[PDB]
Amino acid sequence: QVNPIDPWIINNFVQAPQGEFTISPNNTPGDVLFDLSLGPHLNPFLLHLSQMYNGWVGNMRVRIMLAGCAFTAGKIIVSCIPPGFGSHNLTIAQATLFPHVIADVRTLDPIEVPLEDVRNVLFHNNDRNQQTMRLVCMLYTPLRTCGGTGDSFVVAGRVMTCPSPDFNFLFLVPPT
Amino acid sequence: QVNPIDPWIINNFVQAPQGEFTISPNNTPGDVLFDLSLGPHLNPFLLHLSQMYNGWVGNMRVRIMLAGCAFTAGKIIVSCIPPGFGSHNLTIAQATLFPHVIADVRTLDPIEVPLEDVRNVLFHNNDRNQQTMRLVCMLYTPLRTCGGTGDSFVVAGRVMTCPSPDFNFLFLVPPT
Amino acid sequence: QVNPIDPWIINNFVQAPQGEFTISPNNTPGDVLFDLSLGPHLNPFLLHLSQMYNGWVGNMRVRIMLAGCAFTAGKIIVSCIPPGFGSHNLTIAQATLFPHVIADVRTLDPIEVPLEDVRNVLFHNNDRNQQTMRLVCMLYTPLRTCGGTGDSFVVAGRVMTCPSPDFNFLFLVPPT
Amino acid sequence: QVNPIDPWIINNFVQAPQGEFTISPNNTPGDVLFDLSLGPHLNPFLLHLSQMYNGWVGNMRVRIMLAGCAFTAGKIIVSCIPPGFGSHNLTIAQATLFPHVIADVRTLDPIEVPLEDVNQQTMRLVCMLYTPLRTCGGTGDSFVVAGRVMTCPSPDFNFLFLVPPT
Amino acid sequence: QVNPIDPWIINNFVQAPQGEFTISPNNTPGDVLFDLSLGPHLNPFLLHLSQMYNGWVGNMRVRIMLAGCAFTAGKIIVSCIPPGFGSHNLTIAQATLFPHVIADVRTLDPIEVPLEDVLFHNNDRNQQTMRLVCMLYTPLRTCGGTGDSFVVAGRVMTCPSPDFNFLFLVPPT
Structure with missing residues (x-):
């Protein structure tokens, strides 16, 4: 067994570039906040290292923080839609069917998506978009300020x- | 033993169609918010699959989320009234007598109804309303905004x- | 084995001089709030005692409290940057790469930095700035009052x- | 404790940048033609690690290949001088004091430079034309x-x- | 289950078409000699057998014969290019990163390139295949007349x- 990944990296979480998203009261429910394709390029680490290799296997945990104060109430749905289903047919009700975790904007704790569907990972070359299991987040519930x-x-x-x-x-x- | 239900489905919760209900400050206490009859048709899954079969057995867990911000205080009573008791005689005090769970609009966590009353399920054909154990939710406590x-x-x-x-x-x- | 440190001291936390920092709504994200070099001089205890000795080994836990009320939402990043990396190149995204803990201004509980990187401590004389592993805190998320x-x-x-x-x-x- | 570098590097060799040197006939004996700092940056893969990681410990095994017609006569002197001593004022004789090996330009088998078993001011390695190169009938x-x-x-x-x- | 090809082909070797390359002293180091893509088309016998079988599995042993006298001094490096990485700007400095074999123009006996052992592949133009390429490692200089x-x-x-x-x-x- 060969594991060139530092044990510290797997035990720590690092912010991903282009992973900053903002939620506004004018955002209609069901709007797509951010749609980032899961992959090694998310982590600043394993991006420099990935240049060594071309094929990688396994999954990668993702957690999201909502820096939201009280007096604003809403819910955001995070669904890891399998590739090929991205189109206008997607809707709030259908999103929850895929693996997901419900989150509240008022939460003061990190939210961890249950991306444990290893499903016997086959292969992933770093030159194609095939089987790039994407992550999409939508405003599950309309955002209201409660007259604040x-x-x-x-x-x-x-x-x-x-x-x-x-x-x-x-x-x-x-x-x- | 035959179990044609995917183990993933039982381990995940999916939003039910027509399961969206809204609570307004003008709702008088005891008003019926939503009255959905428990059954396989609630879950988007097992609705397509139920077309294969006609008779089903067992119960199905139900959990509710309240996307409510602070500054508003109230309580909602959820009671799984057995069929035949639905009439004007129902009142807030009598509702709690049936199995129920008390919920607070300010809660930031999902609420799970204790629908564990298997009571040796007899049979349920998908052509009759007999023994359709309904779920009814009412405004247990008047909703107030605390002058916000x-x-x-x-x-x-x-x-x-x-x-x-x-x-x-x-x-x-x-x-x- | 010789341990001239009172067991009570290791089991209790004491405020460090010059360890008071304030966060204002006008603080732009990424601004450095406080940059204190980790060392025995932080604790009022072990400062008087350190006069006896010159060389010390080991690490020292640090925890921070945020006396912040609700209605204000923000996040503060605490990173123990190794010495030599302090310069204009430092940015919010790069800060999280070093060991860190995310904190919320609304939290009502002390935050403990995971400064467990003993990494086989070599030596630390109390006359040089070498290997003075510093602690820097920055406004990870812009501070907003939510119109309060x-x-x-x-x-x-x-x-x-x-x-x-x-x-x-x-x-x-x-x-x- | 863990070994980030793949074992494939350990059992195989790879050329290093700036390692191109030609023994031109119009070169005075003892002239410097191949000077390396003996650092991780020599191996292309190891240079990659230095970008990410900071501390490195260990040693490498430098191998040199020579293209010889089996006719031209010449020798090269390799001496891994300790750090600090190296400077412009370094005659060929002085370098012979430090550990060294003698190689012939006509040697088919590459010479394995002996390196003592072991950061800044690291151990250095220099090479000079020990003997002038002549065609001898070319x-x-x-x-x-x-x-x-x-x-x-x-x-x-x-x-x-x-x-x-x- | 049953191998169709006769054992005679296995015991010998066949020159693949367009397998001839030229090395000249005036050719400065930096110009590729020949580009090869391993496949059944290399062997004419296997090329005609592709009609009877759309899918082929296995590998092929490749040997290179270099002719030269004892005066020349030069080295030829055979580089393995993983699929999808080939680029026009392929210099010699990074050409040795991939597994390779060291050879010289003064060799007499043939040198067998080490091929990594290895999935059924169809007869279509599937780019996924072990590619072989050789580069002029050192200039060819004559030490004679x-x-x-x-x-x-x-x-x-x-x-x-x-x-x-x-x-x-x-x-x-």
Whole structure:
């Protein structure tokens, strides 16, 4: 068994670039906040390291934080839609059918998506979009300020990620 | 033993169609918010599958979320009234006598009804209303905004459901 | 084995001098709130005692409290940057890469930084800045009052510290 | 404790950048033509680690290949001088004091430079033209001897500290 | 189950078409000599057998013969390019990162390139296949009587491996 991933990395979560999303009171329910394709490029670590290899296996945990104050109430649905289903047919009711975790903007704790569907990972080359299991978040419930004159408020949100302990790389490639 | 239900389904909760209910400050206490008859048709899954069969046995867990912000205080009573008792005689005090769970609109966590009364399920054909153990929710306590000028606020609520591990189907029928 | 540190000290946390920092709504995200170099001088205890010795080994736990009321939402990043990386290149995204713990201003509980990286401590003389593993805190998320007319509010914060059970002193020196 | 570097590097060699040196006939004896700092940056893969990681411990095994017609006569002197002593004022004789090996430009088998078993001011390594190169019957001054170097890390290399990529 | 190809082909080697490459002293190091993609088309016998079998499995042993006298001094490096990485700007410095074999122009006996052991592949143009390419590692310099142009000629031939076999039968097209 070969594991070139530092044990510290798997035990810590690091913010992913382009993982910053904002929720506004004018966002209609069901609107797509952020649609980031799960992959090693999310973590700043394993992006530099991934240049060594081309094929990778396993999953990667993702957790999201909502920096939302009280007086604003709403729910955000996070669904890991399998590839190919992304189209206008997607709706709030249908989103929950895929694996998901319900989150409240008022929560003061990180939310962890249950992306444990290893389903016997086959292969993932870093040159194709095939089987890029995407993550999409939508405003499950309309956002209201409860008459707190806080219309000019945006619920800032950030997403971190850490590699799974089963993560590994197969083939070596020279750095580009 | 035959269990044609995916183990993932029983381990996950999915929103039920027509399971969206709203609570308004003008709702008098004891008003019926939603009265949905428990059955396989609640879950989007087991509705397509139920077309195969006609008779089903077992119970199905139901949990409700209240997307309510602070500054509004109230309580909602959920009672699984046995069939035949639905009439004007029903009142807030009498509702709690049946199995129930008390919920607070300010709660930030899902509420699970204790619908564990298997009581040796007899049979349930999908052509009759007999023994359709209904679920009714009422405003246990009057809703007040605590002078937060949030009168134009509605506590959005959604209900999910998952099949019980004991759920099963008896007889096969061709799809319609 | 010689341990001249009182067992009570390691089991209790004491406020550190100059460990008071304030967060204002005008603080732009990424601004450095406080940058205190970890060392025995943080704790009022072990400062008088450190006069006896010159070299010390081990780490020291640090926890921070945020005396912040509701209606204000924000996140503060605490990163123990290794020495030599302090410069303009530091940014919010890069800060999380080092060991860190995410904190919410609304939290009502002390936050403990995971400064468990003993990494086989080598030596630390009390006359040089070498390997003075610093602690830096930055406003991870912009601070907003949610229209609560609380602009004239500052989130007071204090930091305590206790010596680790592995803390020890090597060489004796006369008091100065 | 863990070994981030893949074992494939341990059992195989790879050329290093700036390791191109040609023993031109118009070169005075003792002239410097191949100077390396003996650091992790030599191996292309190891250079990649230094971008991410900070602390490195261990040693490599430097291997040198020479292209020889089996006719031209010449020798190269390799001496891994300790850090600090190295400077411009370093005659060929002085380098002979430190550990060294003598190689012939006509040697088919590459020479394995001996390195003592073991960061800043690291141990250095320099090479000079011990003996001038002559065709000896080639009647041509355009001929040159190509030289390539590849460093393979020893099976004890590892890192200590963690740093964001830069 | 039953290997169709006769054992005679296995015991010998066949020159693949367009397997001829030329090395000249005036050719500076940095220009590729020949690009090869492993497949049944390399062996003419296997090329005609593709009609009877759409799917082929196994590997092929590839050997290279280089002709030259004892005066020349040069080295030839054979580099393995993983699929999907080939680029126009393929210099020699990074060409040795992949597994390779060291060879010289003064060799007499043929040198066998080490091929990694290894899934059924259809007859379509599936780019996923082990690619082979050689690069002029060092310049070819003559140490004799100033040869104006001593063209070093080499030939590449491959034969089916013992494990090579066809699994799916398809009538000839």
